Amino acid sequence: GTFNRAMLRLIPSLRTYAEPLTAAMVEFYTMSQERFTQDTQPHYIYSPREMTRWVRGIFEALRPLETLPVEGLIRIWAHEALRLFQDRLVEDEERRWTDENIDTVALKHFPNIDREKAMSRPILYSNWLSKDYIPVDQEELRDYVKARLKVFYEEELDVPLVLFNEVLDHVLRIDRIFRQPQGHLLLIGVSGAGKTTLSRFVAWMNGLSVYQIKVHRKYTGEDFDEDLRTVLRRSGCKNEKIAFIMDESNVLDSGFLERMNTLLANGEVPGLFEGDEYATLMTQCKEGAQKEGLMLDSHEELYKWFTSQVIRNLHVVFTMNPSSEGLKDRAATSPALFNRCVLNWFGDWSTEALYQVGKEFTSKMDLEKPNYIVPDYMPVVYDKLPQPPSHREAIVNSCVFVHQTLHQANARLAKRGGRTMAITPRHYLDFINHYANLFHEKRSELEEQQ
Amino acid sequence: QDLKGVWSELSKVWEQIDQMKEQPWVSVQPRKLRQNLDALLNQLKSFPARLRQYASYEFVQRLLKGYMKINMLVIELKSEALKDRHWKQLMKRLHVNWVVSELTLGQIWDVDLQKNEAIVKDVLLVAQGEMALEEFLKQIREVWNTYELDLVNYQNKCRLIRGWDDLFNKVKEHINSVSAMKLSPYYKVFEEDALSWEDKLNRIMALFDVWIDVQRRWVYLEG
Amino acid sequence: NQMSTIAGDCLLSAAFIAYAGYFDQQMRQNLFTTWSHHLQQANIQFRTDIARTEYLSNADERLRWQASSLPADDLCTENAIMLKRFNRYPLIIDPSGQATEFIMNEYKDRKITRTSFLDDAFRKNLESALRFGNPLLVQDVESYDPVLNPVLNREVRRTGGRVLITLGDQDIDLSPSFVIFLSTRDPTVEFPPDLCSRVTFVNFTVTRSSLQSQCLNEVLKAERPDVDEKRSDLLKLQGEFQLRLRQLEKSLLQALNEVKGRILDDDTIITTLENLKREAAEVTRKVEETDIVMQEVETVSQQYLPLSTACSSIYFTMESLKQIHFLYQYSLQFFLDIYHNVLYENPNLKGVTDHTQRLSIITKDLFQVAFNRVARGMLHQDHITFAMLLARIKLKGTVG
Amino acid sequence: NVHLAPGWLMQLEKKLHSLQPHACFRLFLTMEINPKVPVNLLRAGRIFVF
């Protein structure tokens, strides 16, 4: 309540709303804490820490904005509520419950407001289309990110990416985490969903360089120390922002996690730089401090400056598969992964995502069929499928159904206790590429015969 | 009158295309070429609908479309992996008189890359394989012209050789690499140099195999 | 008409290639039926009798595969097809070990080398394969080394005139001829989701339905050659016979163009047109007589279904004998040798022409030979146990 | 007494698999029943319990 009365002082028009705002925040925090516990999922922990971040997020959004309507304040409140509570959720039922309860609490504690303007389905905030953190329309965001995707393909790396709404939101989430001191990010999702590509893309936007280590057999802890030394040197001494990206492949070794945990927690790891390494680190750190505009001679002060620079310049990005049993192990061997890293969950590729990916990839193929007649009842798996669907839409719907059939078959085999192999979006991309190649080859054969 | 107007409008585009085609192939920058081709297509798309109906406009538009399509082929050809032997092979397959100093974007663009794409892709795969083998050979040469014996003092009597395991591992690795390169489908070009380096590595291996025994026996007998 | 159905056919075939690789034969068939039912329900045209193994490969490749020691089974032909049209490097799960030999023979003209993840020299062999071009078959993927992630992901960067791939700390080049086949001799194993995503599983394990179908095919070939020929003609009815017809048309076109007015000078081309007419009439007759041959081969197969089920039960009993004692490790090749001895080289079958009587003799001799071959390598205390298991199998098989 | 050499038994199996004997070659492995015998060697042989 005192934190809010302090924060609402930025906008004098809203001062009587501090008590309703803090009541709504506390209420929603309590309901989320009660409903989601560590029993269902390992990472469903909620503490005053979440509410402090909530207050800090609302304060950061309100800081540049000169004046806001009450509906705008409620929109910011709801957006931060989502980004704090809905993001970590695993199940779509849980996400729906949180989304509904946000509107419920906002309308309960804030009467006499327009629900449509206060809260809408594509509730998104970004600072790419304007100087401040103002909400942006999802169509404009799609156009901007499409242009930046084209540029990112011409430059850096060429990683084709379909821009559906889920990826459009994940880009914003990763950007929000990246533009934050000690903004370590934890991405949990099935392989091939685009965790690494999205992080690289957002890092390219924000100017962050990307450092990924090449783990292998005989990749010793000494090699991990060398990689950590290089990234820490670049981040602290040379004031170069680094988006350290580590997958679960190189998290597997237990010796790596201790150093990673210490770096996440304190912004620095003790014993990494010793002897001649410490001497060289101080030699370069003094030059870096002079370049920035600080004159430090004492080794302890120089190391404190180095730690501050690593805090402000290094952003570790963790990615692993959605293994709840394996996620419990990471919590025991690394509490930083759950205390500092902002967990993000986008494992599932929704039916809409599959439909969009199929439609964009199956665009060169000549699937048009004028005499195709829509059936009276169609097994519509993508509920937002335009109707009456054309041959293209029917084919992409069938591809989505094929992927869902694989999911159901694997679920049934897991129920029976047999071995099950993961069905990733890499499988779906492979299936679409196989369809394209085989359709083209067979059409060429038949045209040659004709 | 309309034919005269469309010819006058297309004269600028044709002059720009000729300026492109007169660029020396050495100086041709394919990325800038792609950007300028996109700009030319954008300029052509601004032509009046009355002019757009003529067959010449469609022919030039399709020309620019295929011109953009073979821009990837220009990316691949501009690669430094292509050598004089591969350019001569391209001469033989395409039945052209391309002179090395006289290669130009106009020549590579008069030759229908949209039709000999299979031949060019084959020669470029060959070029990639040969470049991989040649760079392996260059790495071998650099390693074995930089390598030095790690001598350390032994009881102030002499400087005995150290790093026997590392030296033998490097020799075995390079011998096995050359033996496996003899199995490569692009081996016939570098056969002479491969034989020379196999001889060098075998001589090194025999020399140091005798040397380690001599040093060990001498150390024991001195003790 | 074929243009009207190519889209659905390619959809089903591509789905089968991409997915349905790790699953056993029964699950593959179930998934294919599910996809076909959906496509029919969505009014998407697909051929009602799509044979995957003959819509994705032709006779020359299948003959080459058979010459390269690929067993003549539907599952093995489908797996060989997936080993040919693969976008991601395949992972071969063959406890029997025939698929590794198949790959070795298939790529022997390309100087394919065999390596395992357990070997410490695996990194250098992989580096040489990537850098030069000869295909590589890596074994023991249960110990998969994560240096192979860039190779499996095809992360190639082209700086200057070099196509590099950062193998660990190095930056070795990539040759266009490189191709890697992971392998596994252990059917029961769990793979990380990333590895599952980066490879296409090619399951070669033999299950109950797989072995039953294989044994049914073998008995049909051995005892009913006419029924086996009619069954294969149904399969050749799509693709192969049409290709033969097109080859005949090409020959006629070449001969017709060759004559310099000799179309009437010799009056001998009419032999060629009548020969083509007779062959096309044969093909059309076989095409129209498809349902009848289908039901006929179905009934004849139903005649030997109890024998095939007995074969599968016997083999899996042999497999489960390993729990009784550690010495009782019997191979699918051992059981197939038993079956060869039962079908061919059978002294009791000589002089017998009744098909039902021959089937009865084969069914009896199958159990007799199975016992005579297994119990020799068993302690005397287990003879009664194995005889009781075989008696239960026979009691299940018999009708009445 | 081939059971005295467990690893050599696996090596012998590996040699046997990649080889083409003469039409009358017959390798006999007299042996004592023991868990030390490789599973692959057991699978690749015609066992005779005595």
Ligand SMILES: Nc1ncnc2c1ncn2[C@@H]1O[C@H](COP(=O)(O)OP(=O)(O)O)[C@@H](O)[C@H]1O
């Ligand atoms: N929405 C998408 N559109 C296009 N390609 C996608 C999409 N999502 C994933 N991909 C593909 O995923 C691959 C990259 O996988 P990556 O993001 O590295 O996997 P992971 O998420 O397991 O780290 C590329 O081939 C890329 O094209």
